[PDB]
Design a protein around this motif. Structure first.
Motif, mmCIF file in Angstrom:
data_model
loop_
_atom_site.group_PDB
_atom_site.id
_atom_site.type_symbol
_atom_site.label_atom_id
_atom_site.label_comp_id
_atom_site.label_asym_id
_atom_site.label_seq_id
_atom_site.Cartn_x
_atom_site.Cartn_y
_atom_site.Cartn_z
ATOM 1 N N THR A 140 0.835 -1.188 0.000
ATOM 2 C CA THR A 140 0.000 0.000 0.000
ATOM 3 C C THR A 140 0.878 1.249 0.000
ATOM 4 O OG1 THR A 140 -0.178 0.247 2.401
ATOM 5 C CG2 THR A 140 -1.645 -1.327 1.338
ATOM 6 N N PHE A 185 -3.549 -2.480 -8.020
ATOM 7 C CA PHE A 185 -4.900 -2.815 -8.449
ATOM 8 C C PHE A 185 -5.007 -4.317 -8.677
ATOM 9 C CE2 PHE A 185 -6.297 1.521 -9.075
ATOM 10 C CZ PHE A 185 -5.105 2.183 -9.292
ATOM 11 N N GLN A 231 -9.708 -3.808 -10.836
ATOM 12 C CA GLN A 231 -10.259 -3.381 -9.562
ATOM 13 C C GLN A 231 -9.135 -2.979 -8.622
ATOM 14 O OE1 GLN A 231 -12.578 -6.300 -11.028
ATOM 15 N NE2 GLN A 231 -12.975 -4.213 -11.740
ATOM 16 N N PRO A 232 -9.371 -1.998 -7.755
ATOM 17 C CA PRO A 232 -8.320 -1.575 -6.825
ATOM 18 C C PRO A 232 -8.036 -2.653 -5.794
ATOM 19 C CG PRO A 232 -10.381 -0.494 -6.301
ATOM 20 C CD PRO A 232 -10.594 -1.193 -7.609
ATOM 21 N N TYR A 236 -6.425 -2.002 -2.747
ATOM 22 C CA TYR A 236 -6.567 -1.440 -1.405
ATOM 23 C C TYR A 236 -7.359 -0.147 -1.504
ATOM 24 C CZ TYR A 236 -2.729 -4.668 -0.534
ATOM 25 O OH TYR A 236 -1.927 -5.783 -0.471
ATOM 26 N N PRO A 237 -8.678 -0.235 -1.678
ATOM 27 C CA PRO A 237 -9.486 0.995 -1.712
ATOM 28 C C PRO A 237 -9.383 1.798 -0.431
ATOM 29 C CG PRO A 237 -10.735 -0.907 -2.502
ATOM 30 C CD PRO A 237 -9.496 -1.443 -1.868
ATOM 31 N N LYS A 271 2.935 6.542 -10.698
ATOM 32 C CA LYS A 271 1.538 6.225 -10.449
ATOM 33 C C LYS A 271 0.717 6.346 -11.726
ATOM 34 C CE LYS A 271 2.327 4.506 -7.630
ATOM 35 N NZ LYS A 271 2.010 3.250 -6.898
ATOM 36 N N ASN A 287 -11.875 7.441 -2.287
ATOM 37 C CA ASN A 287 -10.840 6.651 -2.928
ATOM 38 C C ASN A 287 -11.369 5.819 -4.085
ATOM 39 O OD1 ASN A 287 -8.292 5.824 -0.430
ATOM 40 N ND2 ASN A 287 -9.115 7.783 -1.153
#
Lengths: 158, 528, 180, 101, 180, 158, 352, 176
Positions: free
Chosen positions: B301, B329, B383-384, B386-387, B403, G259
């Motif tokens: 993260t 992601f 898909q993320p 660690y949202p 990034k 987020n």
């Protein structure tokens, strides 16, 4: 506000508003372009002058599916055939009518009550990937609701 | 009659087709060689600890069948090379742990077969018995799937030397038996083919077969006899546990990469996260003035992602040609449609390779490796991971890692073109190191082609070489006239050429590049 | 050297010598014709044109593309000692139209013309493949005054269709004939 | 060029203009913005004419071997989309050139 | 010698010198005309053209060959001292159409024109045989200013028909006449 | 499944399905191409508006014997003349009808009940070796089964 | 034949229809991809603290049925979504307090089952015992309906690996048993079907399974076996209390929505009255440059509702792109025909 | 046979041997051997046999479209394996037609033949777009040709066929 409209109804077409033909009723609006071949006629009967005749109109209009054919061509022709088709079996026998629409021309000449007596066009024009038409030329034949007087007619223009 | 079709082609003029196959994936690709590259990977099949040139038509077999994500941490490299292949070929080096052993079948004087297994790198020796031996080198454990061998005899040669044919076949889990090749060979010490081809056993084997090697005792070849054998399958050989990967294997592969006598301008992390290996490859990039594509653990993260840059140890003024990547992601598998996670390093390499390869004279080295033309990940169902976690812009900027943001059509663009150069100097970009690397190459080959020439012309050749190379750069638009005319002048480049003695010629050139526009400013206001 | 126009001309000349090719790599060929690549001397191709309509709208007209008006191929060719080109044309038109007058099946007399681009190594790559049939060679003149050049003629072929460019091999048990 | 990139581009353009299946494509995806600018003494350019056009036909072109001093070259004709509402937009967006029926 | 383009040019030149002939072997002749092969100087032939129709289908038009639109022959000729060519033309048109105005039988005034290809030994082989009749020689100019060339003219002949190219000999007991 | 069909019924023609005209009944199907010259008209009668009239249609269709003339031209025209011809003597006096067919247009506009009142064409087009026609242009005149209301018509399109 | 109608599909081919039950729901539609909205709500089913791209096809399914308006203050979000989804789709986020717990069933080495329940978000671990376990994640407390599983053997793979088929179903109170999936899987790590489909247990659970997630000991998977268990129901699941929601949960939802990298053109209140939540949503709207559809508490008269806006504290130039509404009325329930009060935010967004 | 040869150019083998378009028999005075006994659909399809019944019009109808393939793979259908059989037969015919020919033109000829075969296939509609565009996109065909020696042209070709929904299911739902 107003009910649903079809054709080049929004200003997004970027075209002069004056040159637009508009028909409007309680539940439907159709907007198009003033195409060539338009004509109108008024006359009377005699043998000794007996009487007159209501106004007559012959309006060919061209419709272009510039961006959204569903709203500009298919919906337009559907509304047109709904208006011309006499709805005399809508479960309301106490008042069923073939229905009449109001016509606006040049944004300044208004015919409050006119009857779409005849409609025709061609379906052979090219289509889109889905299949909606790109172009059509629908000719319309229109009648006044009565034999309008001079005081009725001359004072109705702008 | 003549209508029935057999299984496979034998020796007859005809057509034989295989049974229809559904679980077989094959793709189209023609390499153009825009950016030679390699990487350290751990796969199934193939010779380990050796450079293998992999094209768009061999990664299926010579690299081996792709494994799955759940099988250890070895799906990352196969996926990485999967996206990498759609641009240009590679020079991949495969590594295996000590558990990997290849199988060997020893045939005695009478042809008696025995089976054994030996670790890779270990030599092969024969005792008094077991006249000779044959071992497979393709890296296949011969157990999943399986392959078999068949030995028969044939007619003799002009000298009367005995000739025997060997046939190879492969068998799947279901049991479908499909032949691959067949070759006749004579045991004679001076065996020759009717074309004059060498029929000497190990020599003929290495000349024809790319899968089997043999060792023959010189004292038993004369007395070696042959026999008719069927279904000869290697047993006891397997790669072992590929999950466990050793820093020793990493450094050996790095040494192989260094000693590889082939050009390669770009290197990849390719699913490698060992700190020592990353440092070694960084030193390789530094001392070969090449570009590195390191990647970090995707599971990190943003909180621990920032210290990971320092934990890399590559921060500094030397390791500036390299770049470091991350992918926080989750995507969906193309093959097994599984929720998977793997780095975007190979995707970024392919993006920049495509963006550079459209330019003709030298390539747009100065091009930002981003944009709709390049910055396209679009694997499946992104898909993320660690949202909950949240990045920081200024901390990220000082961290100097790349990034990623949203793109035009909902796709996901690399919103960065910044290397790990700690100092905030104009070479801390990506296009600037690209131009130093390009000019370094061109200078090298021009110097090498003019090397060892009689004096009196070298300066002139250098002058015209500089002029022509500046011509290519100004055509590419990379270099422009200076923006300061009054003090810095209007000349986009300048040259100095001279010599000190019979040797030691010296050239110093200055050039002014163009802009890239990686940040933009905008302010709204209304006239009301 | 350092002037703007010198830079421009240098860029232009470099990219020109690096990206330009003369009309060198080209090859026209027809199925069933041997040496036609040699005997043919000129080609003029048009796949199809697309027609627009004007629509009057205010002070402007809007033109929209309808439909692919088809083109044709015309090949200028010299013949051999035996007139093999005329022989081939005779056969072609015979297959196209019955001299008895009936209409032949529009599958037996259709020819696959193709132009490929050559390579530096002599290899060829597809550039245009049409399915055409002969129509007319035109009003050609023949005399003895041709005292410095050979009698040569053009042939015009019309494509079968601008839609469904399909073909098959007659060499089969189920030939170009069909079941009624 | 060597590769016939101009013919390649024309092929792509006409393909986008008209479906070879025959259906009518949306008159927004195959429209190209042609522009002629005037140069300056410093090499800068300034707008002179910008049209929104689409390909129609390259004309009947001749190709042979007799072109022994000049290269095979051809013209292309482009028709403007309209003399009214010279509008265009970028396809590179989440809401592309497609619309809602 | 061993280069690809040298090989190509060598192949081309060998097959050219082995398979090419100039417009040398040719002969035009007409039944009933003596020396016409000599006096004729030019020929322009067209058997027939075949017409197509377009059909609108979606975004494509399909053209299909209908029918052989016929052609004609035109021969450029110089005459002799006596004007024998004009004499022959007079006779031909007289047989074609009655000066009294009535319609003659389209069998007595039909001529069999034929062009053959010569050989190395002087032999001739059929190349094209048409059954034609005269129509018009065209608007011809005659003066004295022709001070370096001879007064010469073309004649146009129209084929009898693109269908049933049949002929017979008048020299018989049952002549070209018939029974009503 | 469906009964016998004629014309370009299969996809082997490789043509856009949308541009195909289709007519279907309990035992016969004919498929063709939407050719130019198509038209339609709806109108009413008045003197005071009295009533309306059923829909009218004028459809010219072109048929091509691309591969199989027997099924594409001969069988097609045979089915067409069977449909238009009133079969009122088919040994079933308890129900004999001239028969009506259902029309599909653009694969999305359907007329459930329409009567083929008129047919014409030309037979002078060129033929094959057997003699079947290669091309024809058959023009058709069609009538609605009743004077359909607006609610009947407008809500029948897609 | 055409006369037979089935209920679940295995190898036999037939056409099935809905059973004769007491209740049923529907949800059908296609995504918009035109303009989206986001908002926090409490509903039935769905993962807590999770974003969900809700459309007309899943509005009634994965969000469960509407709850009783008199059953707490959770009816405002359900009314809002009901009125909004009929015309537009969204990216609604849902979270619940820690009191909610999801159930899990453990199969030991012999395959014996053991039932347990853990708070949502808690991670289960496997010790020496407890060979493997499967926990439900859809958020349903497995009480209406219930989740049952039937497991038995099946044909082996092309490699001969032993395989077992398990089918999941939901059983209502009246006894209607509707299956959700029926899959053949194997303990083999490299278990590949003849289609090439992987039969590995965890990969299958994460990929094809959508309601249950399994944890397996990687050291006992080799020694693990299978058993025959039919209609195994989860127990101990609980939705918890939703009338009171912690500001901590509110802010967690706020930050995860922040987020969330999904497009949404507007934000909707969904009836929340937490002042801190309202302010957080306002600042989200401000710094994301979008429109907001906040609402005030309808229960207060005009005289005090007029100051209620600055009482909430959303007045200012920062909250310039948002609008705040008031609904001092009470309408009739669409189902329970009762006095129900909910905002105009969803319909306002739909109209815009 | 009649179904496949309804199409005239090449024929369509993608037709299902179920439904009354083909499965209409109605010979005379049908009598069930075991009126009480009824077939089991799932065991039948597992056994790969073909079962029958009666339609509404009284005709005898074969209500199955599966072959004798033990595995449940896409070969277990009926029309699809016939599709591969037909395409393979045509490929064999064309390869034999072009067989015994000097090199240098063989590759071009085989490519042209396969391309026109693909054209006829897409006209016939058998060749359809891939189910999953994530891997191969919507382009449903791939071909390559390679060489081993003086002989052994290795040609490889993969195609996306269609289906006729052998897996049969349905669910209508309520609204109240």
């Amino acid at each position: 506000m107003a009910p649903i409209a079809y054709g080049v109804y929004s200003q997004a077409d970027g075209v002069s508003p004056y040159l637009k033909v508009t028909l409007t009723n309680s539940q439907y609006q159709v907007t198009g372009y003033i195409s060539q071949g338009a004509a109108m006629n008024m006359a009377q009967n005699w043998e000794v002058w007996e009487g007159g005749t209501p106004p007559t109109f012959t309006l060919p209009v061209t419709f272009i599916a510039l961006n959204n054919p569903f709203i500009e061509v298919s919906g337009a022709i559907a509304a047109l055939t709904a208006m011309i088709s006499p709805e005399l079996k809508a479960a309301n026998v106490g008042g069923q009518i073939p229905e009449r629409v109001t016509l606006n021309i040049g944004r300044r000449i208004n015919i409050t009550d006119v009857a779409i007596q005849d409609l025709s066009f061609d379906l052979d024009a090219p289509r889109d990937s889905n299949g909606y038409f790109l172009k059509n030329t629908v000719n319309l034949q229109l009648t006044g609701s009565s034999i309008y007087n001079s005081s009725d007619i001359v004072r109705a223009f702008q | 009659s003549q209508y029935s079709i057999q299984q496979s082609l034998g020796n007859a003029s005809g057509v034989a087709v295989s049974p229809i196959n559904a679980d077989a994936t094959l793709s189209t690709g023609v390499a153009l060689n825009s950016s030679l590259w390699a990487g350290i990977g751990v796969f199934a099949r193939g010779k380990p600890f050796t450079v293998l040139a992999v094209t768009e038509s061999n990664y299926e077999d010579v690299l081996g069948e792709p494994l799955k994500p759940s099988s250890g941490s070895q799906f990352e490299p196969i996926r990485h090379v999967y996206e990498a292949i759609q641009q240009t070929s590679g020079y991949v080096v495969r590594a295996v742990p000590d558990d990997a052993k290849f199988p060997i079948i020893m045939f005695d004087e009478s042809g008696e077969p025995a089976y054994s297994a030996l670790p890779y790198g270990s030599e092969i020796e024969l005792d008094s018995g077991e006249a000779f031996a044959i071992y497979v080198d393709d890296g296949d454990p011969c157990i999943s799937p399986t392959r078999e061998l068949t030995i028969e005899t044939a007619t003799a040669d002009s000298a009367g030397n005995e000739r025997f044919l060997l046939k190879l076949t492969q068998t799947t889990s279901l049991g479908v038996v499909t032949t691959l090749e067949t070759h006749t060979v004579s045991l004679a010490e001076e065996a020759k083919d009717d074309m004059g081809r060498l029929c000497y056993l190990p020599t003929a084997l290495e000349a024809r077969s790319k899968y089997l090697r043999a060792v023959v005792n010189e004292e038993l070849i004369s007395t070696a006899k042959v026999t008719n054998k069927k279904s000869l399958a290697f047993t006891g050989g397997t790669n072992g546990d590929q999950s466990k990967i050793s820093t020793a294997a990493y450094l050996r592969a790095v040494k192989v990469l260094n000693n590889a006598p082939y050009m390669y301008t770009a290197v990849l992390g390719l699913g490698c996260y060992d700190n020592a290996a990353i440092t070694a490859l960084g030193k390789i990039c530094a001392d070969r003035l090449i570009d590195g594509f390191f990647d970090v653990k995707p599971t990190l993260t943003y909180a621990e992602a920032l210290p990971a840059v320092e934990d890399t140890g590559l921060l500094g003024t030397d390791y500036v040609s390299c770049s470091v990547y991350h992918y926080p992601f989750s995507c969906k598998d193309k093959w097994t449609q599984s929720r998977v996670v793997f780095g975007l390093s190979g995707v970024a390499y392919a993006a920049k390779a495509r963006g550079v390869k459209k330019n003709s004279d030298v390539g747009g080295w100065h091009y930002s490796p981003a944009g709709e033309e390049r910055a396209v990940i679009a694997r499946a169902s992104i898909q993320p991971l660690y949202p909950e976690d949240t990045p920081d812009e200024e901390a990220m900027v000082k961290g100097r890692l790349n990034k990623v943001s949203v793109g035009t059509s909902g796709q996901m663009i690399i919103d960065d073109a910044l290397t790990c150069c700690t100092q905030d100097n104009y070479l801390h970009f990506q296009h600037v190191p690209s131009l130093m690397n390009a000019i370094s190459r061109f200078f090298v080959q021009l110097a090498r082609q003019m090397k060892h020439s009689p004096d009196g012309i070298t300066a002139a050749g250098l002058t015209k070489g500089m002029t022509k190379l500046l011509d290519r750069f100004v055509a590419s638009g990379a270099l422009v006239a200076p923006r300061d005319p009054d003090a810095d002048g209007t000349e986009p480049y300048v040259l100095k050429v001279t010599q000190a003695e019979f040797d030691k010629w010296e050239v110093v050139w200055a050039c002014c590049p163009t802009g890239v526009a990686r940040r933009i400013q905008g302010v709204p206001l209304l006239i009301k | 050297g350092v002037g703007e126009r010198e830079v421009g001309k240098l860029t232009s000349i470099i990219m020109n010598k690096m990206l330009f090719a003369q009309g060198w790599q080209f090859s026209v060929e027809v199925d069933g014709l041997e040496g036609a690549d040699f005997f043919a001397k000129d080609i003029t191709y048009h796949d199809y044109s697309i027609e627009y309509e004007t629509i009057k709208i205010g002070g402007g007209n809007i033109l929209q593309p309808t439909e692919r008006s088809p083109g044709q191929i015309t090949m200028m060719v010299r013949d051999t000692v035996d007139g093999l080109v005329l022989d081939w044309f005779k056969t072609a038109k015979s297959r196209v139209i019955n001299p008895d007058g009936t209409g032949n099946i529009p599958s037996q007399y259709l020819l696959n013309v193709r132009i490929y681009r050559l390579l530096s190594s002599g290899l060829t790559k597809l550039e245009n493949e049409m399915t055409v049939f002969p129509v007319t060679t035109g009003d050609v003149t023949y005399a003895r005054d041709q005292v410095t050049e050979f009698k040569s003629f053009p042939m015009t072929f019309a494509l079968h269709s601008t839609f469904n460019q399909s073909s098959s091999s007659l060499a089969s048990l189920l030939g170009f004939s069909f079941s009624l």
